Design a protein that fits this description.
The structure is a homotetramer.
Chain A lengths: L3 E4 L3 H13 L5 E4 L24 H4 L2 H25 L10 E3 L2 E5 L5 H17 L4 E4 L17 E5 L4 E2 L1 H14 L3 E3 L3 E7 L2 E7 L4 E3 L2 E4 L5 H5 L12 E12 L9 E3 L10 E4 L4 E5 L3 E3 L8 H14 L8 E13 L5 E4 L5 E5 L5 H16 L23 H17 L9 H20 L7 H8 L3 H18 L1
Parallel strand pairs in A: 1-2, 1-12, 2-8, 4-14, 12-20
Antiparallel strand pairs in A: 3-7, 4-6, 5-6, 9-10, 10-11, 13-16, 13-17, 13-18, 14-15, 15-16, 19-20
Helix pairs in contact in A: 1-5, 1-8, 3-8, 9-10, 9-11
The structure holds flavin-adenine dinucleotide (2 copies).
PDB class: oxidoreductase
Keywords: glycylthricin OXIDOREDUCTASE, oxidoreductase
Assembly: tetrameric
Chain lengths: ~475, ~475, ~475, ~475
C-alpha cells in the first residue's frame, strides 16, 4: 500500500492531510476523527498565532526553549501564504480565517513581578533579536480597552504581523481544502495501529473495520502517545502526553464592538494567560485557563470560569461584565511529560507522529505539516526539529534547581494573579514553606528526570497511587534508555 | 379549553382541567424549547417560610401572599403522589429534599439579612410550623470559607424541593394520561368578540376555536392579553425577572440532604443549593428585572452566583464541573402581586405574575382557577390578585424609597465590597435624591417596587417616558 | 525589718500596698521609674477579665482550669479593693472603675477553629460557674456601629465583669502606698545581693546599695533576667519573655463611648479586640500580642494598622474619623511554660510575682494577698502553690496538642486580617505548615514544648536564638532530672 | 520705630527673619512664636524640595498654575547657597540640612488613571520643556524599594538635583542663623496687630505685652489671615486661609537602611500623596495625608494613620510593616481659599504677609523671603510673585466646569487609592450621582467664585451653618471688589 491514514481531525491532522493530498495527488489519503472533536484543543482555541507573545524568560533560558521559539518565528512566516491557499478553495461567504493582523501585549500588576516583569523584558529582547516589527506604545493609545483603573496596564507593546485566526473557520477551510485536493474524510476513530516486521500495515477503527496503509500519521492530540504506546517497546520510548485542560469563552459584547488587535498578557502561572481574540459578528473570544490533568476532563470547573471572567472584566474591558455569555469552551492542550513536542518518524517504517504541542500546535501547524511531508518524501524537512523526534529518552531541558525555583514562583503567582490580599509577612512565609515539599517530591520521583512546573504541581496534588505509578514510569524509561 | 403556556402553571392547570372535566377537550400550547422559561431554570425550592422578608410581611398584600404559600405547602405530598402515579421508577423522583436549612452569614446587608432572619423565625412560630434554630456545626455537608461562614442556622421541617425537570416531565405525562392534547406551537393572538373568547391564532397561522382560554405564558402573559379592547390599562404589566442558575457535578458526587439557602437578598436575588439525584447540585439564583426579555446569562451574573456558592456554601464547588448555566424569566408584575383568575372577557382566564414562587403555589393556583371555571369561588384569599385591576399600592412611596436605597447598598455588601468606611454613608446620602426625583416624576399615585424602580432608574429616557405614559393611562382608566 | 519591692507596675504596687498596710514592723521601699519602660500595666485598658479570657484550649488543661478558678476568685475582691484605694484620695483623683459589665461579640473576621470554639467555651464556663449572663440580640448592643461585612451575629452580656482605668489604678496604688508609710525610690535594681542562701539587698542603677531582709521581684518581663544571675537560678526560674502589646487612646468624634466593655474572645497568638470605656470622651482600644525574645518599646506599623482596622470595622466606623491621642506599648510578662511565677525561692527572703501575661492586673489583689500571706508565714491562697517560681518547666499540653494549636493560630492570622485568597490556598498552607512546626518542636527538646505563642516567635527567630534555646532546655532538663 | 516684628516661627517667618536681620543690621528684628509650634506645617514636613515632582496636568492647565511652577523651578537654584549660609553658623554636631540630592517618581496602579497617568505624563513634559536633567529608568534599577507585587510600580522617573532637607535640622539652622544675624526670638504669640492712620504701630502678645514696630511680617501659617482680618475692611480684602491638615510619620527601619533618593508618587486625591524622605540615623520620613478643615485640628485621625501606613508598606517597602513607629506628626498646610499664595504688602503701611503656600512654602522659602525683603527695601523683588499679593479679590484660576470635573475625579480617586474592591457597575453609578450634588453646591455658594476641589469637598461635608457663613463671606467679597 502507498495509502496514507491521518489519525486525528484537529488543526495538525487536517493541516498534514491537506499538505499530503496536495503534494501526492497519486496517493489515497484518508483522515479519521468525528465532528464532536471530543477534548479537541483546536475548536476551544481563539486562536492567537503566538510566536513573540508566547516568549517567557524561563523558556529562552534553555537551549530546547530557544529551539522551540526559533520554530515559532519560522512558522509565522508561512501563515500569510497558507491562509491565501486555504481561502482560495472557498468564497467570500465562507468567512475570513484571519481575525486580526497585530497583537498588543499589556503589562499590569495583577500578577507576579517574577513572571510578568521578567516575561515582558524577554518578549522585548526576543522581538529586537529577531528584527521583528514592534513598538512600545502609550497605554492611552490602545484601542477599545476599558480596564478597572486598579487592574489597568502601565506598559503596552504592539507586535506587527502577529495576529489571530477564527479556529472554527480555519477547521472548515482545512476540511474544504482537504476534499478539493482529493482527500477522503472517514468519520470514525482509530482504536489500534497495526504493525509487524517493523512496518505499519494500517489502522483498526472503532466500528471494527480495518484500513490498510503504507503510512500512518498520528495527530490525535492528547490521545496520540496512548495510541502508539501499544506497539512493541514503544511504551517507554514515546514520551507520555497528558491533558492541558483549557477553558475559554465566547461573549457577545454589550455594543457589538471588539478590539482591532489581539489583546494579551505574557504566559502566567502554570502556562495559563489572559487574552481576547477578535471574532466577526459582535463576538469576542476570551481565554484561557490551563491545568495539566492526569486523566482527560471535558467540563470547565467553577474556579476556571470565575478566574477567566474576573481577569477579562477587570484587566481588558469592564463592558464585558454586562455582556452575554454565549459558550464556555473546554479543550485539551496535548501536554508532553518532558515539555517538548513529538514531531517526526519512529523505529516503525511509515509511522509518524505530530503531537505534544501544548499552547502553540495551531500556530506551528503549517511548518509541522511541511516538516512531516518532507520526511515522508525522503527529505530532512525543517532544521532544528531533530531534538523533538517522537521516539526519545525524556528531554531534561532545565536543572532540577531551575524547575524547583520555577514551580515555587508559579505557585506564588496563583496568589498575585487572583489577586489576593494577605498580611505582608504571609507571602515570604509561604515561599519558605513551599520549597521543602517540592524539593522532596522532585527527589522522590526520579534520580534523573524532573517534570516541568506545570506537571510537577499536578503530581504534587495527585493521589499517592498516581505519584507511585509515575515513579515506576520514570524508572522504566531510565531502564530503556540507559 | 386552550391553555396558552407549557410551564409549571399552564401544565398544572391543564392537568387539573383534564382530570376534572373528562367531557371537555383541553389543548395546551407551547414549544419544547420553552424560550425564557422560568420553570426549567428553577431548582426548585417549595418556598413558603424561606421566602419570608420583613418588607413583604409589613404589608397586608405580602401577608396574604404568605398565607397562600403556607396553604400550597399542604397540597404538595398528594400532588406529587398523583403525578408519579402516571409514571414508573425509571422516570425518577419529583421530590429532591424534605427539609431546608436557612443560613445567616455577614456577606450581605444587616438591613436585609438580619431583619429577614428575625421575620422568618417569627413567621414559623406564628404558623406553629415545625422548625429548630440549630448549631452551625450541626449543618451537614457545608464547607464555607471561614470569613463567609454562617453564625446562625434554622432547620425548617417539611419545606423541601423538587426537580423542576422531572416535575415538567411528570406534568406532561399526567396531562396526556388524563386525555389532554399537547400542540407544540405558540399563541400569536387571542380572538374575542361580543365580550367572549372565540379561540387562539397560533404562530403556524392556524386558528384553534375554544369556549375557554387560560393564559399562563409566563412573562409574555400580559403582552398577549393587552391587545384585546381596553385591557392594555386594565391588566397590570408583567416584565422579565431574568434569573441565572447552574447545574454542577460535585467533586465527589456528594450533595446536602436538605435545601441550603439564605433569605431573599438585594432586588429579590438570593443564594441556594437544591439537591438533585446522580451527583448533581442546583445552585441559584440571580434576579434582574429587564424591560425587554433576555435569554443569556451575563458574565456578572455567572461570577456572582459562583462566588457566593463557593464561599458561603461549599469551597469544594470551586473544583466541581459546570454542567449547565440556565436562564429563565420570572414573570415580574409591575405592582408586585400575581394575576390569577377571570377577566371582563367571558372564558378568558390568567395565571401569571408569580415572580419567585409560582412553582411552589402551582397546585393551589391550578385548583383555584379550575374551581372558578366550574362556577365555584376557589380559594378565599386570592380575590385581591384578580388579573383585571387598578395597580396595587401595597407600600407608601416613603417605604419603597427606603427599600430601593437599602437594596442598592445591599448589592455592595453582598459582593462583598471593600471600601473606605466614609464611602457607604456618602453613597446612601447621594442615592436618596435621584430615587425620590424618579418616583415623583413617574406618577402622582403609583410607585414601582424597588426591583422594578432600579431597572427604570438605569433604563433609557424613552423607556422612562413610555412608563410615565403607561401609569397616566392606568390612572385615567381606573380613577 | 526592711522590704524592697522591685517593680512599680500593678503587681509590685499591689504587694507594696498590702505589705505597708499589714506589717507595721516593716519599712517597705518600692523601686521603679515614672517612665515605666516596657510597662504592661500603663498600656492596659484594662478589663477585669475572668469569663471573657476563657478559651477551649486553656480549659482543656488542668493548669488552665486552675488559672481560671483563680481569676473567678480575684473578681470577688475588686469592689472592696477599689473602695480601699479610692478612700485615700478625693473626687478629683477620678474613678478606678470604668464599667461593670462586658459584651462578648461573635463576628466572622477570624478562624471558626478559635472564635466559634471559644464562644461556646465562654458560654459553658459561665453556666458551670452559675455566673449571671445573657445571650442578647446584637440589635440590643448599645453604641456599636460596625461595617455590615464585619458585624457580630451573636452577643453575650456578662454581668459584673467590668473594667478599670489602669492609669487611675496606678495613681491610686502609689497614693495608697505612701498613705500606709511606703517609700517610693525612683531608681531601678541592677543586681540582687545574696550570700549564705539569704538576700542582703539590692544594688540600684545610681550605684547605691539598699539593704533588706526581703526582696519581692515584680519587675514584669525583666523579673527572671534579674533573679537568673544568682547561683543555679538560670535553669531553676522559668524564663519570662516580652509579650509586646499595642493599644491606643482615641477621642471619639462625638465624645460618646459604650456603657460596657466590648470584646471578642482571645484570638491568634493571645491577641484580641476590645474597647474599654474611659471618662472624658476617650476610649481605649486594644490589644495586639507578639512574643519577642528581646524587649521592644515601640509599636510596629503592622500592629497599629491591625488594631485600628479591627476596631473601625468590627466595633464602630465612627472611630475612623476619631482623633488618635496615644499609641501605647507594654510587655506582657510571657512565661516560657505558660504559667505564672508567684511565691518563694530557695533564697531566704527572695520572692517573685511575675509571668502573668494577659491577666496579672485582674488577678493583682488575689496575687498580692497570697504573697503577703506567705511572707507572714501563712499559706496564702490554695492552688497558687503549683505556680511557685522555682520549678522545672510545666508541660501543661502534649506536643501533639501544641502542634495542632500553633497551625490553627497561624491560619487564624489570615482569617483575622481578614485575607482574601483563592479557595485552595488555605488547605495548601495548613498542609505545608505542619511539617516545619513538627521539625522545630522535635529539634528544640526531647521533653519540653513551648506553647504556640512562643513556638511561632522561635520558628521566625535567628538560628543562633533557636540554638541558645536548645541549650537552655537541655540545661533545664539536666538541673531537674 | 524702624523695628521689625515677624509673626510666626515656621520656615517662612524664620527665612524672612534671617533675610531681614542679615540685610538690615541697623534694625531690631523680633520673631514671635512658641517652641510647641501648634498646628505647625514645617515640623511635620519631610521635606521634599518639590518643583517637577509637584507638577499636575490640572495645575499646568491654568496660567496661575504655570506661574507658580516657574517660581518653584527658580527657588530650586537658591537652595545650595542658602543651605551653605545656614550650616556656616553651626558646627558638625548640628547635622546636615540636605538629606537627598535626587528624587524617583514611581507610577503604580493604586490610584485613579485620571490623576496618576495624566500627572506622570505632565511631569515628563515639564522636565523636557525645562531641559531639566532626568531619566525614565527601569523599575528593577530603583534601589532599596520592596513593594507588594500587586502594588508595585511599572514606570519610574529619576529627577536629578530635586532633593530633600530635614525640616527639624532646617528649623534649628534658621533659628541659630537668625540669632547670628542679630535677630531676637520672643517665644510668645501675637494676639492683635495694632494699626491707626493706615500704618502699623506694633503687636499685642498673648502675655498682654505690647511690642512697637514700623514693620509687621505675618507668617503665622494657617492663622495668618484670621490675625490680619480683624483690621478695618481686611476681612473681605485678604483671602481666607484654611488648615490643610497633614499626617506624616517617622519610622526606625527594621535594618537601619533607607533609600538614597526621595521616593514619591505624583500628587493624588485632594492634594495628598505618598513619599519617603531619607533621614540620618536609621530613620525614614513617610508622608503625607491632606484634608482641608474649616477649623484647625492638631491630632491625626485613625483613617489618616492607616491610609499613610498601608500606602507606604505596599507601594514602597514591605519591610516598613515590621519597622518601629517613632512619631505620628500632624501640621496645617496654609490652604488659601482661591488656591494661590498671599505674598507681599497690604493697604496698611509696614504690614506684610507671607502665607497660603499649601504644599510647597518650605521649598519656595528662600525665594519668597528674598522677594518680601526686596519689597520692604523699595525694590520689586521677583517678577512673577506680584500676582500673589495678599490684598486682592479672590483669584478664579479655573472655570466652574473645570473644578466640577476635578472634584468628581478626586472623589473617585479616594476609592482607587484605597484601593477599594467594588462591583464593576458601582464606580460609574457613583460618578453619575456625585455630579448633581457638587453642581448644586457650586451654584448655591456664589454666582462668581468657585472654591477649588480640595476646599469644595470640605464645604460639601461641612454643617449647613458653615456653608451659609461661606455664602455670606463670598457675597461680602463680591460687594467689596465689584
Ligand atoms: C432562576 C429561577 C429560579 C427559580 N426558583 C424557584 C424556586 O426555587 N421555587 C419556586 O417556587 N419557583 C422558582 N422559580 C419560578 C417561579 O416560581 C415562577 O414564578 C414560575 O416558574 C412561573 O411559571 P409559569 O408557568 O408562569 O412560567 P414559565 O415557567 O416561564 O412558563 C411559560 C411558558 O410559556 C411559553 N410561552 C411563552 N409565550 C407563549 C405563547 N405565546 N404561546 C405558547 N407558549 C408560550 C414559554 O416558552 C414557557 O415555556 C424560579 C425561576 C427562575 C427563573
Ligand atoms: C496591651 C496590653 C493590654 C493589657 N490589657 C489587660 C487587660 O485588659 N486586663 C488585664 O488584667 N491585664 C491587662 N494587661 C496587663 C497584664 O495583666 C499584665 O500581666 C500585668 O500588667 C503585669 O503587671 P506587672 O506589674 O507584673 O508588670 P509591669 O506592669 O510591666 O510592671 C513592671 C514594672 O517594673 C519596672 N521595672 C523593670 N525592671 C525594673 C528594675 N530592674 N528595677 C525596678 N523596676 C523595674 C518596669 O519599668 C515596670 O514599670 C495588658 C497588658 C498589655 C501590654
Amino acid at each position: 500500500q502507498t495509502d496514507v491514514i491521518v489519525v486525528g481531525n484537529g488543526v495538525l491532522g487536517l493541516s498534514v492531510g491537506v499538505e499530503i493530498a496536495r503534494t501526492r495527488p497519486d496517493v489515497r489519503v484518508t483522515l479519521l476523527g468525528k465532528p464532536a472533536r471530543q477534548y479537541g484543543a483546536t475548536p476551544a482555541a481563539g486562536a492567537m498565532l503566538g510566536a513573540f507573545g508566547e516568549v517567557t524568560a524561563h523558556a529562552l533560558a534553555s537551549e530546547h526553549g530557544r529551539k522551540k521559539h526559533a520554530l515559532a518565528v519560522q512558522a509565522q512566516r508561512l501563515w500569510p501564504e497558507w491562509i491565501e491557499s486555504l481561502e482560495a478553495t472557498g468564497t467570500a461567504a465562507d468567512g475570513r480565517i484571519k481575525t486580526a493582523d497585530d497583537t498588543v501585549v499589556l503589562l499590569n500588576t495583577v500578577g507576579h513581578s517574577a513572571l510578568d516583569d521578567a516575561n515582558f523584558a524577554a518578549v522585548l529582547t526576543a522581538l529586537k533579536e529577531a528584527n521583528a516589527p514592534h513598538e512600545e506604545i502609550a497605554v492611552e493609545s490602545v484601542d477599545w480597552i476599558d480596564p478597572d483603573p486598579n487592574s489597568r496596564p502601565l506598559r503596552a507593546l504592539h507586535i506587527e504581523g502577529e495576529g489571530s485566526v477564527d479556529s472554527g473557520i480555519l477547521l472548515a477551510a482545512l476540511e474544504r481544502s482537504f476534499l478539493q485536493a482529493g482527500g477522503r474524510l472517514h468519520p470514525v476513530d482509530a482504536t489500534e495501529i497495526r504493525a509487524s516486521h517493523g512496518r505499519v500495515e494500517g489502522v483498526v477503527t472503532d466500528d471494527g473495520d480495518f484500513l490498510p496503509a503504507g503510512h500512518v500519521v498520528v495527530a490525535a492530540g492528547a490521545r496520540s502517545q496512548r495510541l502508539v504506546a501499544a506497539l512493541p517497546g514503544l511504551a517507554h520510548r514515546i514520551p507520555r502526553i497528558y491533558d492541558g485542560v483549557g477553558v475559554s469563552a465566547l461573549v457577545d459584547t454589550w455594543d457589538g464592538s471588539g478590539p482591532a488587535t489581539v489583546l494579551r498578557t505574557s504566559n502566567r502561572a502554570f502556562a495559563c494567560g489572559l487574552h481576547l481574540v477578535p471574532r466577526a459578528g459582535g463576538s469576542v473570544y476570551i481565554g484561557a485557563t490551563n491545568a495539566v490533568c492526569l486523566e482527560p476532563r471535558g467540563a470547565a470547573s467553577i474556579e476556571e470560569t470565575v478566574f477567566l471572567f474576573n481577569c477579562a472584566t477587570h484587566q481588558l474591558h469592564r463592558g464585558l461584565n454586562g455582556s452575554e455569555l454565549r459558550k464556555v469552551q473546554v479543550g485539551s492542550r496535548p501536554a508532553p511529560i518532558d515539555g517538548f513536542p513529538l514531531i517526526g518518524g519512529t523505529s516503525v517504517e511509515g509511522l509518524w507522529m505530530l503531537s505534544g504541542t501544548y499552547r502553540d500546535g495551531l500556530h506551528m501547524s503549517p511548518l509541522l505539516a511541511r516538516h512531516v511531508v518532507s520526511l515522508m518524501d525522503g527529505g530532512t524537512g525543517v532544521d532544528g526539529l531533530r531534538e523533538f523526534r517522537p521516539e526519545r529518552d525524556l528531554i531534561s531541558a532545565w536543572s532540577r534547581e531551575e524547575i524547583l525555583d520555577d514551580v515555587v514562583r508559579h505557585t506564588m503567582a496563583t496568589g498575585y494573579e487572583f489577586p489576593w490580599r494577605l498580611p505582608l509577612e504571609w507571602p515570604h512565609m509561604m515561599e519558605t514553606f513551599l520549597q521543602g515539599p517540592f524539593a522532596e517530591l522532585a527527589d522522590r520521583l526520579s534520580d534523573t528526570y524532573t517534570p516541568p512546573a506545570d506537571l510537577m504541581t499536578a503530581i504534587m496534588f495527585s493521589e499517592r497511587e498516581q505519584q507511585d505509578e509515575l515513579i515506576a514510569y520514570y524508572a522504566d524509561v531510565h531502564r530503556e534508555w540507559h
